[PDB]
């Protein structure tokens, strides 16, 4: 069946904006997962999980009689797809059960782990999501084996279809670097937004970089990929040594024995894959990665034996039964247990990437400190495991249940509690009137509130106007935010705020976070008024102001908009067309095609463009909220041509006279070009659409203002 | 960006079931187009369209000063994608403005026609859809040029994204037959469901079959493709000769001059394509098909000149300025006007496919009758033009506005008016009790009402339970409908109906159409009771019984379900796997993936399978409405393997014992295989879901029972 994607493989793809519709969701329109989970008996689930760890199923027998290691791995892979660049991946939507992740080679045999959990999923039904369950099971595994976790939060709602994520351009699973779709260039520079060394891997190659077993050079890939998952050196050592305190790898026989991954398997396989022809195909004969390493003398118990071994022996290169490179301690006694035969013991073994922890000079200092002080190791791994498994969950307001840790961590971008009465509707009207009387313009008001709110991304639920981080480093200095104009606006708003708070009785006060958003509302209302329309923009107070000390400047860097088509802004020259970056930003902001369309056409005529550019400002009444963008864009009396100086800027000229009327960018003109976007623009550019345009603009404006307001959920 | 489609190009694609969500739709959830159109001033629209006909724009100057010909073509292409096999295509959704149809070669320069209509669309806004407007414009073109149309109905709501339609497998535009993805096999057999000879054509190649200028062999393609668009010989001759009474073709220079189609054109083209480097690129120099033919001496006026020319001259083969085959009149004078130069005239010309109307023996008899009796030609073309442009609109109850023809036509599958009081809630309870007391089983009741209602298809809105056509030829004889069992159920129902109607006072009576559906409802109620649930199934009366004379048996044949996964039925072996045909049927029935899932799992346990097959009957309490299908399908204690005798049938055996528990087909097992469908199955197979299952089943049941109920819309 030949498709549009085949005929026009470079057209913009809008279907990413309409995933996760009510059509695909089996739960009713009013189903609220938070409410279901809040009544779950979490202790009873955990008791069932605890029992499961030692209840072996014959179709996938438990190593050492304990599934703990398999489930830690499952839970680390669920969380380990996360990329700080865009917030995509991570455990927060249970995407390991869908394509492509369910069939990545690094997820081999995790289908078995998920199937072992079906009886418990089934028992508790909608009260616990798959997404939550994968992580909870990892925690219970750790607890059952003697490790004290840092806590657990529920609240990850299930999704019902694959997310659209750019995982790379390679067309071959696990393809070595330097091919025609190489994710590397320069001196081993991995392209953004990617966070793994090869297609279908979580982070790095366990044999070493493109299979070269050099622990020193493997360390470089480890450090780079972990950093791209937001983990520093201490957290990376803790997590890798922590995880490899448990279980074993599986490489009993040659990998040519292993059949089709789950999405390619026969229907009879009932969602499982990697069926193996090697001996029994499972248990003692299991093949997963092709490596055959067991790290500790007690694989089903927390210990400090990973570092005891790593430092206590000298290591020699050897090959597994699939020919993969790995390491053995030859001077050692056979002290490591066999997973199925009580009369067999084995020498200690390590992966190339484990030895990275000892032979990279920076990691060795951390590993030594953890070796000498296993209490510090345990605390670091607990904190890192929590961060790993929660990093994409959003503000603490989304955390559910009785085990949420009370310690507030800097990586959570914390927001102080509000301990005072909020402004009411009358107070909000008085504040809007003072904002408008200060002389701040519609353009300034709208640009500032847009700049504060539009940092939100739905992928990990970071960003948004809550916190007033726009006044702090680094957001106050981001080029897109127009640092000098921003500073002038914030100074006037802060004087309004000081006066208003100073006049109050009884504890009432307004945060700068709320006032920045409310001021933006007043600019939209004024713009509507300038066009002859009386509207009220909704506004919900309750944001609080975060301090500079509560704001990790380096972690904020990924939220900088380097492309924001809603402000006609491109920080530099990119390989990806500007219109594709626009749909990418729309997806992160959780907007549908119609909402992206209304919003951008309004922002254009309100003066939200960076630098006061005229590109796309197709109106003679700037700062009035009208549908002028669409009416003028779609006017066939105007002819458009790329400029001689810049092919990404277009001149719109009267077709008869040649007079220059407008200029625009690819972001502006795609609304007149793309067949679906133009059909949208036509709705808003029709003679009967002034009221609809205004109402829909206000609704999406309000939606953007509230994206991070999980305190009102 | 490598996608799931790339890695697993044969996995089942469910996104076709979630197209047309509220996310992609710019209108609000409550927007009702029928109500908007009912308030449009249609007379005012028509006046503006009349004015447009002769308001020539310099960017696409009107031939002969009159756009009429261009617009008739536009309207005929809008309607001309329709295939009777599946009901897909046609004018009813305005799909000509989206990919791929906006860029098919046969739609070249229809982008210009649609852009000429933007000022009018804009003026009237949401009150007239693009889909209605394309057809109305056709009609007005005809009227402006002196032809009285048979009428017009509004009510085609606009859609907002491309429909998923199989248009063929060729990867080259216009590919000639016998390639690696050939749509032809055998003795020129066109594959179902296709209705055109080459990818990107409406019906046939105007030069002749695969470009061979043989009018007799072209006739064969014309007859086959037109039949596959529901037109017989009389209607086909009328439409081709009627249409070619107007306008001209465009082939002024070589086609190498013509650039990118709209979906491939640069952004500055603003949604237009086929920009030509030949001379002015437009008007006198236009290139569209590459042929250069003008049929009549008055191309802007209705006349009888097409058949005068066809028969009045002998024809000689020649070549257009692009090298295409076409025909010129032997020894004729230059009598045909030039489209732009009043001092030029041309000899009469014809397409190969025009000459088919004279050289095919069956067409020649019709064409001669129309030549001798122009009033018969005029009436047949008016009727056929109405059929062409309304064939996919569905029942007459959907037709809006003041120009709807009062004559009821066979092709509309008409349903008699209801002229009598309907049964009320008391009467429905009494009828259900009589149904249940007759001894009809749950299986019989549910299977019969399924068979009656599930013929509906949303593509052209044909089919459904209204009319009671299940009791008529050919539906009563369809293998899927189990003719002998069906007859015995209809006999018992008809006795119940006769007794009930016989006892009424006033004119109250129930239709057999209503009673079939009501009886199905009673079976669902009884099934719920068998499972210990108290359930009332909604029922809406008002269906009427159609007669055999109101039921075209040959046109009904396309509605026969040859694959119906909801009854585990496959009439033969097909190229397409059975799970693909299931999702196809789900689409035609307007079901989302969750509705398809719930519905099939219920039907299985209610005994709706054809032939009482056990395949997928995963319950020990058949005829009880439970979620057993899901709970048993997902039981990992059961292992599935294909049978020796049939690889499309599977045995489910206890994994420990080897005992045979179940058998299933690919339709059954795909719910335990495909990662998205299995996620749905898991919701319904959870311990907390029996109530949700029952409720969701009754909702989708009722949906299916009401699919054709446009009288309640
Ligand atoms: C440089 C980073 C890492 C590399 C290259 C890596 C590599 C691997 C490989 C190749 C396996 C064997 C898979 C099999 O054949 O069955 C495995 C097992 C495992 N890994 Fe990792 N690992 C990494 C980090 C982590 C982290 C961060 C955790 C958790 C905190 C983790 C926990 C585990 C566990 C528990 C197992 C054992 C599986 C079982 O017992 O079935 N690893 N690792
Ligand atoms: C065998 C079926 C048919 C064939 C192969 C066919 C072919 C064509 C072609 C090749 C053109 C020239 C396009 C161009 O270069 O601009 C055209 C024009 C047109 N056809 Fe057809 N046609 C068919 C049936 C129809 C029908 C059913 C109608 C309407 C009832 C229709 C009405 C028109 C009209 C009005 C034009 C003229 C457009 C103008 O003046 O710009 N034809 N046809
Ligand atoms: Cl994601
Ligand atoms: Cl369609
Ligand atoms: Na994410
Ligand atoms: Na259709």
mmCIF file of C-alpha atoms in Angstrom, chain A residues 166 168-172 175-185 191 575, chain B residues 1-2:
data_model
loop_
_atom_site.group_PDB
_atom_site.id
_atom_site.type_symbol
_atom_site.label_atom_id
_atom_site.label_comp_id
_atom_site.label_asym_id
_atom_site.label_seq_id
_atom_site.Cartn_x
_atom_site.Cartn_y
_atom_site.Cartn_z
ATOM 1 C CA UNK A 166 13.864 10.346 17.198
ATOM 2 C CA UNK A 168 18.624 7.921 15.400
ATOM 3 C CA UNK A 169 18.820 7.483 11.558
ATOM 4 C CA UNK A 170 20.503 4.080 11.359
ATOM 5 C CA UNK A 171 18.612 1.363 9.469
ATOM 6 C CA UNK A 172 20.450 -1.572 11.026
ATOM 7 C CA UNK A 175 25.090 -0.548 13.711
ATOM 8 C CA UNK A 176 28.742 0.338 14.410
ATOM 9 C CA UNK A 177 29.640 4.041 14.185
ATOM 10 C CA UNK A 178 30.873 5.690 10.951
ATOM 11 C CA UNK A 179 28.212 4.227 8.688
ATOM 12 C CA UNK A 180 26.081 6.344 6.231
ATOM 13 C CA UNK A 181 23.735 7.300 9.175
ATOM 14 C CA UNK A 182 26.482 7.632 11.776
ATOM 15 C CA UNK A 183 25.263 9.311 15.028
ATOM 16 C CA UNK A 184 28.919 10.401 15.576
ATOM 17 C CA UNK A 185 31.107 13.046 13.897
ATOM 18 C CA UNK A 191 24.454 14.082 17.809
ATOM 19 C CA UNK A 575 20.130 20.827 9.649
ATOM 20 C CA UNK B 1 14.400 9.311 11.575
ATOM 21 C CA UNK B 2 13.969 5.535 11.540
#
